[PDB]
């Protein structure tokens, strides 16, 4: 079936939209070239729908169905409960989407009698109607990216596809207990989900360190979403209930399974009949958990179809790595693309195909890759990097506007052991709460999990916590990855790095000269600009 | 060992503390006699603690060795996981004490890097360390009763023992899990928190039908959170053990029992060394659920050491309610006694004795009793109220003061098919709300779990949900609920019952002629009021 059928009306915004960056003081002392950055917007949604929009075909072989049988049995050691609708809404996000039954995200955290009795409302309905399709929102996503002249300048706007608030409450109450300990099981190490960048790198390193020839490649999934089928769906259902669940969990999952996951109409902001989804819905509950078991499914089959050797994947949603022992140059070549045919019939075609790699740095995954620098002592470190261009866009844009959504302190946290976030992200910004007397004021961030309420001031601790001491002394990094942090200076231009050593130099002596835990800051997070 | 050692130092308070009735317009209007309405305050904690210090004598035998394996058992069945810090920050409720730390409740839901900083630095130190003592504070609780003229009239203050913020916080990542799920497996329908008001009844009802001759009785332990030994403590711990948990689970469960819940030092909240505790805390995590098992399994092996018939007991903390066959009153009477000579060796020594009791109406649980009215059809509907004293005494207060605690409203809920909080309680609140044109503005809640948001608007809603809608027409209540209310009006000065239907019909006129959502409560709240 296709993925989509669309009726003609439009995907609709909810807001003013901007797609050019704010020009400047301040964000034109990080990047100069304010034209190559750029924002989504739902004037490019058209696009995006004829990009995600196709007939799936899918044939299913025994290594498919082996690879199930196993999954199954792991499933079926697992025990999940449901959730109140108390603790439900005490994990719902608190900027998410208001119900346009009138409460919004404050009110469901808050346990408003308003919200609380709507979710009441929507979980009996959810037991008693196990048929009607539930009504979805689509909507146009505003991201910010840099032009990619030379994979067309922009991206049209991503999409997505939700339910009401409500329901997503609901989702939780059956499933929340399920999608958070499940894969894990099943999975094993394989699950990227349970690792922290340090985490990931670690085994990574030891997987491809255990082959006595690596070879490895990532798997992109051309538009993954729109790749998983409604018996993919069904079948990702069928290892919900192999789970030890409470009755109406079982009512519940199946209800959604049927009414929500499998498919329904799209609604636009707007209020009228966009179309019709027979795909994964990118806005539910089970999205990362649904194409995580379905993309290590498939995958694990498709190793097999390959006759790959000693694999070991890691598997992130849509996001597929695979290390393997290489058969030879050749040999390599053949099986990827025995692989990639196998991928195809079980509906995941490719993006671009993949290809053998036999240096692990060249490997990306979750748009990171390992990399090694040196510590103090001289002792070699592996650490998590990625191409910095959209960061560095991400941080410019958020030097010219506020937002709850400031990408760049997320960026420090998470790449704080990596050149350019030490470089360029901490000097930046530093340097602006320091002339602004911001040093002390907390800012929202989400993570890949929560929105995280961050003090400036408490950084030294988050990163010594998360990447350890080594963080605050890395040296002699890794040719390639100078070649391409200066790669990406010069496409943006943002300031050489002689230019942010020398400013920093700066920045950690307004922090010392403050004393106290802005000092701490000037030590730690600054002791590469000194000496 | 003594359950308390003292230093001399005092239980000190936190803030101003008022003893006296607020006197008045709108709070004279309900309750005349104001002087009969007092608080707990500080003062009174000397006393107290006089009250909860004692040594405890605990001598087990086969009862209770078989009671505990089959318990044991239970618990082998259920697994549980960790929670991760930002999971059990967010199941932290609003209003709870601040860290001396630096940060407050709000700073945890809203996950605060310095909050989930520390959080991070208490769990590895539980890990790490599963000797030291953690650090208690004292305070004397603020809580208004009525004068007992006849049980010396005020009680002093009781007292709430509990850890700082970030261990309370580690206790949810241990211990949210189990304590949610391992109560229900072990005692199944002997577990009283699984219920609504209306299950509570459904249970005890069915209960005391199904027994030819049914006898009842509640049993009050003598301060129960002292009569708790560390053996009780570690007979806990150990039946947590037998779940399935994770490794940093067992170890935090371990250490939390070591450190925390076995004992510590009590410190004030001037700083000062005001004592040592060797019982149960009041305000740890597990005081409920330790409590529910250690009551549970005192007085199942009571039960057998007592040869009482088909017992049934329902058991919520400390509270325990057990329904048997009678053997005849004076073969009942000398059982009991035995009873309660094997829970006192078991260190569960009572307030007054028991009695047995052979009308349901006169068995009181949970401060609560079940009773008997009639709907609109004229059908038999048992319902769960009680002594209308204490709530009359709060609500009296709540008039004069605002407060986060307004019981008046909790009690409309829980409550809301009694007569006492329909004719006086409803009546009395939505006359207010509607005089100072408050009906649609929203009032925090403490029900039996969470904080709500409440909006007056959604009582009818509320109602509905929990009680059914033969709450909006009972009608023929029992004699001996008539004259309880009767009597306490009486008592406090409240105007009759007359005065109150009556004023209701003036209130149900506001309602009606608002139209809308407050007509909606004119004609569900109020219909007994015009016919
Ligand atoms: C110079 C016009 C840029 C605008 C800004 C925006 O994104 O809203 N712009 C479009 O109007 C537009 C359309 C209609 N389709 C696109 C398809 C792919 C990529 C970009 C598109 C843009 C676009 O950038
Ligand atoms: C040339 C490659 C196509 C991409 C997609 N593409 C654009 O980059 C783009 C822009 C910047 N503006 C447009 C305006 C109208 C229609 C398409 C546009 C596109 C576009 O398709
Ligand atoms: C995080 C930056 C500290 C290190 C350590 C060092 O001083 O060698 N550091 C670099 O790695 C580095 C590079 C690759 N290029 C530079 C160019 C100009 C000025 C400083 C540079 C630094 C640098 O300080
Ligand atoms: C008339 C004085 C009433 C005060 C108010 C208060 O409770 O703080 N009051 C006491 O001072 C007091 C003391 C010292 N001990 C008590 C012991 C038992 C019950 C009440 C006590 C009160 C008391 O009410
Ligand atoms: C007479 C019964 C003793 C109770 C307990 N009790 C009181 O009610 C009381 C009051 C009201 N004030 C006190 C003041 C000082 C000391 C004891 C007090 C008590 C008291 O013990
Ligand atoms: C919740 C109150 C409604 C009922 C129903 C009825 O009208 O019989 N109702 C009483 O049960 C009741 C009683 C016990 N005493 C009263 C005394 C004076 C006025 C009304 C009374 C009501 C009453 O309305």
Redesign the interface.
């Known amino acids: 079936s296709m993925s989509y059928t669309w009726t003609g009306a439009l995907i609709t915004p909810c807001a003013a939209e901007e797609s050019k960056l704010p020009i400047n003081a301040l964000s034109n002392s990080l990047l100069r070239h304010h034209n190559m950055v750029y924002a989504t917007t739902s004037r490019s949604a058209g696009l995006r729908q004829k990009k995600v929009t196709f007939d799936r075909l899918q044939v299913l072989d025994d290594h498919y169905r082996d690879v199930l049988k196993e999954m199954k049995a792991k499933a079926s050691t697992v ?1 999940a ?1 449901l959730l109140s609708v ?2 439900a809404c ?2 719902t996000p ?1 900027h998410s989407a208001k119900s346009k039954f009138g409460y919004g995200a404050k ?1 469901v955290r ?5 919200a ?2 709507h979710i ?1 409302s929507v979980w009996k309905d959810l037991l008693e109607d196990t048929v009607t399709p539930i009504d979805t929102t689509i909507m146009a996503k505003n991201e910010v990216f840099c032009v990619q002249p030379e994979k067309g300048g922009r991206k049209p706007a991503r999409l997505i596809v939700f339910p009401d608030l409500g329901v997503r409450v609901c989702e939780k109450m059956a499933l929340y ?1 399920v999608v ?2 499940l894969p894990q099981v099943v999975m094993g190490s394989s699950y990227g989900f349970q690792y922290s960048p340090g985490q990931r790198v670690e085994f990574l390193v030891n997987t491809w360190k255990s082959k006595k020839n690596p070879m490895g490649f990532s798997y992109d999934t051309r538009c993954f979403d729109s790749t998983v089928t409604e018996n993919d769906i069904r079948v990702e259902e069928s290892i919900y209930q192999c789970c030890d669940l409470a009755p109406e969990a079982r009512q519940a999952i199946k209800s959604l399974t049927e009414r929500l996951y499998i498919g329904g109409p799209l609604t636009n902001s707007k209020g009228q009949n966009c179309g019709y989804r027979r795909c994964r819905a990118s806005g539910v509950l089970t999205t990362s958990c649904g194409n995580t078991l379905t993309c290590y499914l498939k995958a694990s089959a498709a190793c097999r179809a390959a006759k790959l050797q000693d694999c070991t994947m890691l598997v992130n949603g849509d996001d597929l790595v695979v290390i393997c022992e290489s058969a030879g140059t050749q040999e390599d070549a053949a099986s990827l693309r025995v692989f990639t045919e196998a991928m195809t019939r079980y509906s995941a075609p490719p993006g671009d195909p993949p290809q053998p790699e036999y240096d692990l740095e060249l490997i990306t995954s979750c748009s990171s890759n390992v990399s090694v620098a040196h510590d103090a002592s001289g002792k070699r470190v592996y650490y998590l990097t990625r191409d910095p261009t959209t960061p560095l866009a991400r941080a410019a844009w958020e030097t010219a506007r506020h937002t709850p959504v400031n990408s760049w302190l997320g960026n420090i946290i998470m790449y704080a052991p990596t050149l350019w976030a030490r470089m360029i992200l901490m000097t930046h910004f530093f340097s602006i709460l320091l002339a602004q007397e911001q040093l002390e004021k ?1 800012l929202d961030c989400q993570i890949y ?7 400036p001031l ?1 950084l030294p ?2 990163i010594e ?1 998360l990447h350890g001491l080594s963080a605050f002394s890395l040296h002699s990094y890794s040719p390639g990855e100078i070649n391409r942090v200066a790669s990406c200076l010069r496409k943006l231009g943002v300031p050489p790095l002689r230019v942010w050593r020398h400013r920093a130099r700066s920045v950690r002596a307004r922090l010392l000269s403050q004393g106290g835990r802005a000092a701490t800051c000037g030590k730690y997070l600054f002791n590469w600009a000194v000496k």
Do not use: F, M, W
Request: some cysteine; proline content about 3%.
């Open positions: 025990k409960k108390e603790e005490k994990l608190p009110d808050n346990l408003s009698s308003k609380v009795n009441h207990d958070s300990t907390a999990g929560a929105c995280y309420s961050i003090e408490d601790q988050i916590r």
